[PDB]
Design a protein around this ligand. Structure first.
Ligand SMILES: [Cl-]
Ligand SMILES: [Zn+2]
Ligand SMILES: [Zn+2]
Ligand SMILES: [Zn+2]
Lengths: 304, 301
């Protein structure tokens, strides 16, 4: 019993973190095989970030401009290239601690663990979701650029995020490991606003199932609704539409608790209209949307 | 910017997790040097749940009755002893991944990271606090016994918790690594209940300072309070009394934000009176109490 915001064990990723310096700019890098991946803005000063031409900034640099440190050991840079908003530094040694890994791009609503790093040193690990507006509500301070987000499936690390910046509202933006931004953002110190965010409906539903599994049943309504009638009420409270795909994804949890998906939708519809009436669900006074149906099954099934 | 329930990187503890089996009971063990530490109830059969005499159950065991597995390798048990509620299994091989470590006993209100494990394999990591009633609000299923709680500083891993049981309310109980239970709990399946859980006041105040550091001040007010009037009000909401030691511990956060401790106490009194009114603080619609003043400082600066 119990339900927590749980992150993947971070050991496989800790062995990949390095410090990358270019001039006076220092951030984190990810060392896999004989390559170090980091944000392309490592080649910028504060002044360059106002309006950078990364093509020109990189063309005016050589292997000598980059200093990579894996703890106390310096790694020799023998090649460099840019792939979108990430810089790839070829080094003379393959990381002996390279785990089985792949680079994956996630969709809004999906979750991942972040290993916050400073000067190549891991400081903490936490779980977050990619918002429908493509930002992440992280916890990052200066020097955290290059920190990565990941999931683990069996013994394979799927890297999905590399941290690049903080937007005016204090939320965060980054890219996948191939340097493609999530969201309509650019790596430049300019006026950038995160769009209006919405609630990940399928995740709130999965979390209501976790609450039932843990004995919280006060909110249950069994006057079955339809997907169409639920969506009409849901869109009014800034909730993402619930697709039939989402309903199918909720199948295993529905069978486990004896609560049909459209009965949980009826329960959520009333929760939106009434509010929580001074009550809590799983230790929260709001409807949590950063747990996917797979996170709920995994945590309520003890998968390793 | 931002504020999250952050755990310590779990790598150094993952390299210590092993599986321990005695008969048909399997749980987790912690392998440090040539010793594996695990809950002593690994020696219990179905008839030993209510009133086990562990000294009598253990005297009947030989080294070869304990099966220890680290990955795909069986470790040979060459000795065994019991210290309070933990069993120490001496093995013939020292863990080459043993980090620098210490065993510490934490106090209520303090936080630590838990590495949830099943069959010696880590499944996830989360942060939690020792409640004033000496229970933890963890996330543990059948097979999680032996999972540990820890903190990391600049030199060592400080192990502070080993998981042993779940209570009827869904909360958890365990011991330090010397086998001493936190609270009045025992390793028996007799009906036990956790005392009234109160809110960790000093932690709520630390979290309000984190909200101010992160740019939010909506909840502040123009008042102050004496420490006694604050305690008389806060105790009516099941909050633990705030001591002068707690006031002094909040000093650096008070100096960073320019908000006197007793002025933050006045804000907290008003928040208890009014609630959130549809607002949130650091993404929460409740007053959060599982962040210590040090967790706030680490994350905010
Ligand atoms: Cl960049
Ligand atoms: Zn940066
Ligand atoms: Zn057990
Ligand atoms: Zn230490």
């Amino acid at each position: 019993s119990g339900f927590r915001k749980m992150a993947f064990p971070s050991g496989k990723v800790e062995g990949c973190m390095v410090q990358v310096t270019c001039g006076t700019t220092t951030l984190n890098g990810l060392w896999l095989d004989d390559v170090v991946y980091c944000p392309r803005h490592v080649i910028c000063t504060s002044e360059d970030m106002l309006n950078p031409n990364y093509e020109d900034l990189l063309i005016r640099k050589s292997n000598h401009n980059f200093l990579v440190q894996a703890g106390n050991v310096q790694l020799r840079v023998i090649g460099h290239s840019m792939q979108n908003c990430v810089l790839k530094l070829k080094v003379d040694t393959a990381n002996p601690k390279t785990p089985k890994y792949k680079f994956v791009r996630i969709q809004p609503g999906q979750t991942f663990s972040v290993l916050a790093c400073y000067n190549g040193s891991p400081s903490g690990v936490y779980q977050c979701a990619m918002r429908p507006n493509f930002t992440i509500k992280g916890s990052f301070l200066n020097g955290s650029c290059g920190s990565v987000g990941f999931n683990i499936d069996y013994d394979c690390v799927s890297f999905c995020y590399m941290h690049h910046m903080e937007l005016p509202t204090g939320v965060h933006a980054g890219t996948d490991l191939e340097g493609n931004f999530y969201g309509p953002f650019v790596d430049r110190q300019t006026a950038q606003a995160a769009g209006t965010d919405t609630t990940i409906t399928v995740n709130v539903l999965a979390w209501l199932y976790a609450a039932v599994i843990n004995g919280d049943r006060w909110f249950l309504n069994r006057f079955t609704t339809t997907l169409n009638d639920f969506n009409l009420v849901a869109m009014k409270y800034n909730y993402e539409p619930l697709t039939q795909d989402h309903v199918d994804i909720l199948g295993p949890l529905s069978a486990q608790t004896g609560i049909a998906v459209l009965d949980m939708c009826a329960s959520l519809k009333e929760l939106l209209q009434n509010g929580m009436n001074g009550r809590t669900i799983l230790g929260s006074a709001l409807l949590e949307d950063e747990f996917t149906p797979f996170d709920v099954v995994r945590q309520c099934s003890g998968v390793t």
